[PDB]
Symmetry: D2
């Protein structure tokens, strides 16, 4: 309960204050994050734990099914601030196998308001219908999870924010990853782009190397 959490915070804080009174000293030392993590609200496994990144190195955004919608100002505001103000060098979009958002999109359950958000994933399911169709029933949702991350990476790269940052020569690299709850091992979908040209090439080869695998 809320009481338990409050208790935890107290103890947790107390402990650190003693053992490592410097812990809060480091944090007090303004360290601009160098990475922007865009993941799902499910947050099955915190980004910090998966990567060993320490708090302060990560600027974070989370929504249902880790989407980067062309016109979602919430995510775009996070991206623009991180890129233009914090000047992060890396942006990572991470999905996860078994994601409830991804599943709900396909198993179209009348969940309410949230379904509108999920229609963006449904567009993807239909876009890659042949590929998804030509494969085992049990492999489709996971493949869709990967297709989603790749499509969002593509959207991120085409945002005016990224196009303008690359055009002016700023150094920003975007990545697309995914992981399962059975080992928490990150899988690089290999759609890493450092400019507008590689974005296209990596998108193309990524989608095609799935049809081959």
């Amino acid at each position: 309960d809320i009481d338990t959490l409050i208790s935890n915070n107290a103890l947790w804080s107390k402990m650190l204050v003693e053992e490592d009174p410097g812990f809060f000293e480091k944090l007090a030392q303004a360290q601009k994050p160098r990475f922007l993590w865009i993941g799902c609200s499910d947050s099955r496994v915190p980004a910090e734990r998966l990567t060993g990144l320490e708090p302060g190195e990560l600027f974070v955004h989370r929504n249902v099914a880790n989407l980067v919608i062309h016109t979602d100002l919430n995510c775009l505001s996070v991206v623009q601030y991180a890129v233009d103000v914090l000047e992060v060098e890396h942006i990572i979009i991470c999905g996860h196998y078994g994601c409830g958002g991804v599943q709900a999109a396909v198993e179209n359950p009348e969940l309410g308001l949230i379904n509108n958000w999920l229609l963006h994933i449904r567009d993807i399911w239909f876009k890659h219908s042949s590929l998804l169709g030509e494969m085992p029933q049990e492999r489709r949702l996971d493949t869709l999870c990967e297709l989603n991350v790749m499509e969002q990476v593509y959207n991120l790269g085409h945002s005016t924010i990224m196009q303008s940052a690359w055009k002016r020569g700023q150094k920003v690299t975007i990545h697309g990853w995914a992981y399962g709850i059975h080992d928490g091992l990150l899988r690089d979908l290999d759609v890493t782009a450092t400019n507008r040209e590689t974005l296209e090439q990596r998108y193309r080869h990524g989608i095609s190397n799935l049809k081959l695998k």
Copy 2:
């Protein structure tokens, strides 16, 4: 740390667990709906998992700049609706933190670009409480605004059709407004906890009143 470093940490981290504690992945595999929805800032100075001492999978999370719950932001509203109507979280926490770069930039409109539009929502608050903040010892305004902001977002959340509907349906959901600083990482309950429509209107005023009289 370059990308390859992060991937290296994960590989090793996962290997040790797989061996050392396979139980970790079993707990995770066990589909247990989150009970809390955390709405924090993208700055994420101290991860909510650390702060609350919760295990992964116990929290449904949403993060945006300066932790806002804008009346018409479908991103945050969709997270909320899914959590409440689908995952049925019992608690929703909006947590801010003193020193937030968003809150600061909002009052110092540094011409940061696109992000400024999002921050005008904090500026509205800065002006709304101009007297309370004007009678403030300057160097204590940004921290106050930080708390004022959290309270306003809690207010907006309680007023969302999502929340009004849930409460009317008689569903058990409590919303909280917290804050903490990076000197102790200690959470301060802003005393704006609401469990229904009535409590919402009251606790809200009796949350702002505190500061304007203390």
Copy 3:
């Protein structure tokens, strides 16, 4: 100038007050609109003029390139109010040939913020690349204008707002139209749907009857 407009309003009002003092009396007579028109901000030719509809019969929404984005709360709020509150019986999405939004999307000119909005049209251009590709250069933009309207109609029909209204049995029909500035003659794209089932069928046959024509 602003002065001219103000002058016009005065005269226009004065005139009517005399000739037809009842004009404002009818308006004063609360007449819930029966149609919702969703068109482009260009508004080359006002909806009222194209259809002969009189003010008050039309509830209206306008954005660049007449889009109905899965997650655009502005348009969705107009739709939900019109459907659930005003109970309009008809919703019409109307595009127009030569639309600057449609052209800008393809001729990808770095126009600023607006380009993010237009990425939704670009998705369509690429979705129907084969069809568009297998046709005259001069016919592509106009065809894209039509494809856009059909895709937005499809989006509208899949919104939770429409799905829930149809499921509960409310009578709502959605249409997709377009017109050119050379004759202002409305062309029915024929994707009219009265329920969730006809929506799918009309979408399918509409897209396919274009490839044939």
Copy 4:
């Protein structure tokens, strides 16, 4: 009127023009950028073309419920940005109208569903001016709110990065706040016209002050 009726009107209407006045389509064919951006309500009780007496193609238009210019609404902001930076409109008009169903529903929160979230933005205003409206003769509040709303949206527009940037670039753009009623269809300039950042802050207060002292 059923759909087929509307299509019939168009067919006939177009035929007569094609014959009677072919010049109409020539004027239209002549690409002449709009000079005004009109932001009105979806109610559209009286089309702006009628109100201003403008020809088609002279106005770039945007309509939403209760004519709002929300800080973070990308729909309206994209229309604005395109009009200002691309079409280079010289004037932007935000026009409200007394009796607006959105303004009314906002203060009477009838549990209309999704639309209520959008209307919370008007409610914020209703509360913001609680005294001015509290010292109002009740039956005159909704019309006041209507005007207050327009002024607030004009304020939000002037503060958008889009507008701030344009003005800083030294681009000539003027924003206006109007309103009218369906008894005379006469436009009332709410006196909140702004041509730059300075004028914006001033005219804004000197627009609200009028009402709170008159």
